Amino acid sequence: VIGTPWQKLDRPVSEEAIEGMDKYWRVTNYMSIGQIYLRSNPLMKEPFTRDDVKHRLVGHWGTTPGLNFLLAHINRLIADHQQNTVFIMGPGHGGPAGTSQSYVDGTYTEYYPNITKDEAGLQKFFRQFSYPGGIPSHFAPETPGSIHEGGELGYALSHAYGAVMNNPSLFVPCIIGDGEAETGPLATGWQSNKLVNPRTDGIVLPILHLNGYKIANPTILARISDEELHDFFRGMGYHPYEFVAGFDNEDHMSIHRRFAELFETIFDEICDIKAAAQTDDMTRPFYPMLIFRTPKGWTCPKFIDGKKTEGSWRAAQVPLASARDTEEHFEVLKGWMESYKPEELFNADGSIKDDVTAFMPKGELRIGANPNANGGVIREDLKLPELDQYEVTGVKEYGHGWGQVEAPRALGAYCRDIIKNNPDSFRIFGPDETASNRLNATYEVTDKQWDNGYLSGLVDEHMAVTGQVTEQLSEHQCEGFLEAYLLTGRHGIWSSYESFVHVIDSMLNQHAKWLEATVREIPWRKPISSVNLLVSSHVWRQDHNGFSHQDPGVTSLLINKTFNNDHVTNIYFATDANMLLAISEKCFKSTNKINAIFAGKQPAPTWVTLDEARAELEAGAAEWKWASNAENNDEVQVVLASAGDVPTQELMAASDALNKMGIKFKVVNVVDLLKLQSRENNDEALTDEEFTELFTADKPVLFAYHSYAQDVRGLIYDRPNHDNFHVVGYKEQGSTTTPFDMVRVNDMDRYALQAAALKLIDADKYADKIDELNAFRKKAFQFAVDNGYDIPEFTDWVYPDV
Amino acid sequence: VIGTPWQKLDRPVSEEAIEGMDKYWRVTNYMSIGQIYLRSNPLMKEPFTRDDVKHRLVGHWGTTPGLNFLLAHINRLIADHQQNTVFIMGPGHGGPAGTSQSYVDGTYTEYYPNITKDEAGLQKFFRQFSYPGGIPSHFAPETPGSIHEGGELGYALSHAYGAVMNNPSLFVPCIIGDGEAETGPLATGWQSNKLVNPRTDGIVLPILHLNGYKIANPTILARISDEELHDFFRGMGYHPYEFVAGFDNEDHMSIHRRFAELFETIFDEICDIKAAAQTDDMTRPFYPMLIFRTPKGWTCPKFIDGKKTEGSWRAAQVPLASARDTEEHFEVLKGWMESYKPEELFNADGSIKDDVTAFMPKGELRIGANPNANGGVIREDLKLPELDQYEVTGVKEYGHGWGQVEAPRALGAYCRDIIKNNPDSFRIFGPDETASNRLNATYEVTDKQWDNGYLSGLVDEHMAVTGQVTEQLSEHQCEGFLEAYLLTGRHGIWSSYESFVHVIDSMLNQHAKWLEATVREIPWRKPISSVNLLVSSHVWRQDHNGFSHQDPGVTSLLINKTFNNDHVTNIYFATDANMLLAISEKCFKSTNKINAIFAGKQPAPTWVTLDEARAELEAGAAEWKWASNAENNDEVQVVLASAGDVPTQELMAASDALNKMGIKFKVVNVVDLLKLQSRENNDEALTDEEFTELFTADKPVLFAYHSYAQDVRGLIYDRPNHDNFHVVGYKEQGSTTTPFDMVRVNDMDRYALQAAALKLIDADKYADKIDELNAFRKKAFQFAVDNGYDIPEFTDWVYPDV
Ligand SMILES: CC(=O)c1sc(CCOP(=O)(O)OP(=O)(O)O)c(C)[n+]1Cc1cnc(C)nc1N
Ligand SMILES: CC(=O)c1sc(CCOP(=O)(O)OP(=O)(O)O)c(C)[n+]1Cc1cnc(C)nc1N
Ligand SMILES: [Mg+2]
Ligand SMILES: [Mg+2]
Ligand code: NA
User: Fold this and answer.
1) Residue from A314, A735, A740, A795 to probe the interface with B (highest B Cβ count within 10 Å)
2) For the domain A403-620, what is the CATH code?
3) Which residues are registered as beta bridge partners of A525?
């Protein structure tokens, strides 16, 4: 247990804590300005001149003094209540507030021993901010205390709420930009309080950093009427409190006492909510939220060159852009830095005085040191059930190509038992698609958690105020909740219709970048569980829907995060249920990855045994010798290669037909796509030798690919024999139609694959046969048109091994 | 002018209109069920049997009878008030409500003459829904009345609001799913009413289709308390009205009279708002919104097999899935269809009776016929200013590589004059980045439109209640507003930081698919203006930000919409301002496209004259002979090829160095990326002959690419000489650092490009030189570290022609 969760003070905040909070705010403002502006002389020792100012002034002043003020008060809170706390910095461009926090709390020097607590350390701390060889502009993963960089705005609330799930002792003050609040993802993030339980989960305190402005405009929320603003948050299930400061001549000490008293009223209400939830965990309470209204750039010069700067969008970037070049800007900078009175905050040796930090939390309650903000320190391996009990044994008993299994159902049973064995640290998310993607065997041991109104057992099924499945019709919520759940040391999976995974492409990009920086240069940030995404209900079999639901292209986005041997991205095609089981065990064991797991949910053949899936998954691509009819590679007339359940089914039917014509070929299945890249681009890929063995040194290769052919073509560009690959992929053809028609219009159906194989072998010799196959595809189509179902010869085909 | 906008009735709705609305609702429910279930015998003539039921039952019943009820009332409204109206179907899976609407209003037969108004037409109309060779499941662009397919949920409100911008006579009832309302984009879409003006823009009426459920869960908005629901919409600036029907035994006629009276109160308030705005266009009014609460699946059987179906998520997909296979499901279907009493709705010849449609609007006020729902019918070409006045003439007067121009500034001046010449039909959108991406010359002739509180001229600049620039910190809003603005026949552009364009990848996918279907098979849907997206503040020069802001990968997404010779997607790299001007003229003239226009905003050299940009843009890729030093292709030791402003600058510096070493090469610039693909994949690309002429038959090609190298490698896979291309792209390296460091860490800087060129020519011979260049890159880096700015030799370099 960290600290003493949810305890009220029952006395006023002491005047000593108020004095320490004002010193914190002044020292973090001073050091934030130092980080932005100063390359040397951090204490302004004589002579302090323009030569000490950075040659390239980059940064974001405006948000920062508001964050520094909140962080003083959140530190004071944590210390007085001993409260287990992780904050979210929505405006992650306020990086200096986050580095200054860690430097003040001591974690920065503990993690970065060269940045010492004295004048030499402080000089280095100032220069290194946003500087070549130094540290990023934003609250990056290399900053102690960060689980959210806040570079691409909008995910503050999904991350805050995902962090408190199954984390009942954890308090998350979530600082949200008022511009950020204009984004789609942030706007829906407010509603997460209908999806957490106040007994079994922790508590988020949203703090709207209502500083009036974004970069070059006011914000929507700052300029609507106060009555609209309050109705808005009340309508979303909060009790809104509002603090206003900095717009008049109120002295800073008074402002701190008034905020502290407010923040104690807010926390007391949170503690009341927490105590009440021990007895009534079914009534959803109105959680406090804080509207925090202060001037953007607070404490910087009010006017610069006749332009209003404090209390304006003009405070957003770097005030005094000429500070190095003109004595006029330099004099203003010097007076600004002096207004914090650093001679009271730093000892002569340049260490921050003890009376600045006596009010601060200590040990693991510190914001930089809490293990929830470095969740791999808390993470434990899942207690996984034995895989073999889930195997589809139909392949062993009856043959390769057996049955009509809906593949994700085996993964559902496996997830069900993972939740059973790990009852509060593995969650499932779905955007109203858990049952649709066939993972609902999980409801046998848990419920979808819903903390909002109930009506009737006639309609509410598998739903309770507490449970380990979460659904909301928002891919952004599912992805954001899951990410923070991983970042605080837990585990899980979500599922999406494949075309809609694109809604969160940009979130996958940011989490891949978090992983990239981490695996490369932050070894103190320990490994977290991987994002596991079941990409299902795919392009080939969106039977109730149509062309809007046909876009397998997240493959292509993911290929853009496969560099430097980071190995943070995996693209897997689950050929069948036994392959899916093998991939899933692997993904549930992995760490520091995004794993995109493609599987169809339609009734489909099972191709491999579980033991075979395990070996094949390891290699990445494998010959299926029981399906090949060639003796060796020299005999092979064409390589039949596929990735995806549907391309594989169609290739296999083509192979059966090609066999019967006396054509010689081998069958290669591809599961782990990026293992096709060269060793030069991927040091864990197939060697050229293994690749050549699979795909031959010079026979034609027909490659039936689940997604866009572009992907495979770009990936094998420097491989031996790549000029002989013919890649067939999805090509933006399709509608609401039968399963044969969908493969037909993309040249993916078995008859077109048989034709393409013939064309690659001898176009002249097989001209007639190619024609007959093309004519058969027309006939099968006319049959679907006239009759309303696909031709039996198509649908009724079973691989001859069965 | 269409109809008589914003007129009140001043009498009750007649009892004849109520009777016609009930017949409409019954006939559209009946035909929607017919579309889903029936392959033949649409009037249930003797014998009506299971053999008439579709073999594959696919569709979405639950939303549909709610949409049919609203559409009866919206038709009645349009007719009585003669109101210019386009509706949005958020739940686009309710396609049968939209096809039934068009069939009832007459447009379906006018556009589709084979689907006639009689028993044979009706049989064909039923069978073709969601059927091979037939029509889509959703409200697709081939349906008269659609500007929004609603397949990927969330964009209903940005589309509704973009449609009414500069459209003051237009009324848009926007039907929003209550599951859809859980998405990010929909949640922020509510706030658009702070960004429209009630005098100069039209009016959106959001109608929340609060049917209690999404696919397999209740919805958040249906289960919060009524007081939260109302506070929520009031807090977002609406006057909420709520209608509740269908949960008790109230007869249908009474329900219609009560709704009609409500809908007239709502419309009267909209007409009052419209009249008031003629005098006070500065006070933002509280626009009505309608909470419409009815049972999902309304009018279907209450229980099926002991399970509650009407008023449940179980109504979502296809009730009675066994209707063809069991007499039990068939009998239930038969009684359901009979409950609408079709013998009262259809004449003996199977035409819909005149008394079903006497209340309907006629002519161009019909929902299927309004030209705002087919905006290419209204669209006019922009009055474009002459391009030559914007040219950067520094290249002509001083030489290739001249100056420090911020390229988007020339596009800003051009946009300024486009707005001047087309003052109410060209808009700019930006996610708080218009000034940051340098398009702010537009503010010289217009303002950012902001209909929310003002404070002071000290902070509000270039902002007014009416204007043709719109900003909100939401890429989803900018993209959605713009799309509907184009779809209703107008024009514009938006700009985004390049890495954040990914936020709307999935919207680009849906609009590309809309374009695909349209160019292929909907010739009555006339061409609309193109989406023009200035992709700027790119990966190489995000000076105040860092790694989160480095992702040029929307190139890769866009490559996935380049099929079938649809030609709906363009990727352009603006080499400099004169190239940007030429690309922009082209894009502003184009139709039916998404145009992604890459340009850097940093101070940068201008390479080509405007006349040269015009010729080069047409070819797609061009040799720069004034920069090449080889005589002919046989002399060429390496092809220096680049795409993007920064890769080009670095390649050009490498060329200057390579020249001075006596290396022979040619320089090729690439602007129109997809023109690199083969003719087989792109019938407007460079021929093999032109390609070979640019890139040689067999010399090595060094290709410096702005984005991920994967893209170029996949694109040129079947081109002559592609095995000799070495593609250098962004490789997920970078942080907050100097401009040299950013190109350095991706091997993109001039010294690494010079080295790579040497390595391709003779690795052994140039081993030492390659070493010295590698060592110089280390030195330049150490210099940035020690000094705080890049080495003068790097920054001060100007191409020798200047
Ligand atoms: C850094 C950057 O690229 C910023 S900071 C900023 C203004 C944020 O204002 P907010 O009110 O939220 O925060 P404040 O500084 O505390 O006032 C924008 C638009 N941007 C560009 C941007 C655009 N779009 C998205 C999704 N994310 C970002 N980061
Ligand atoms: C069709 C499809 O793929 C549907 S329909 C649906 C439920 C919508 O419920 P809503 O309450 O909005 O509408 P209703 O039918 O009127 O009750 C979902 C989750 N989906 C999958 C889905 C997921 N995510 C997104 C962005 N879009 C869609 N279409
Ligand atoms: Mg702000
Ligand atoms: Mg609904
Ligand atoms: Na090749």
Assistant:
1) A735
2) 3.40.50.970
3) none
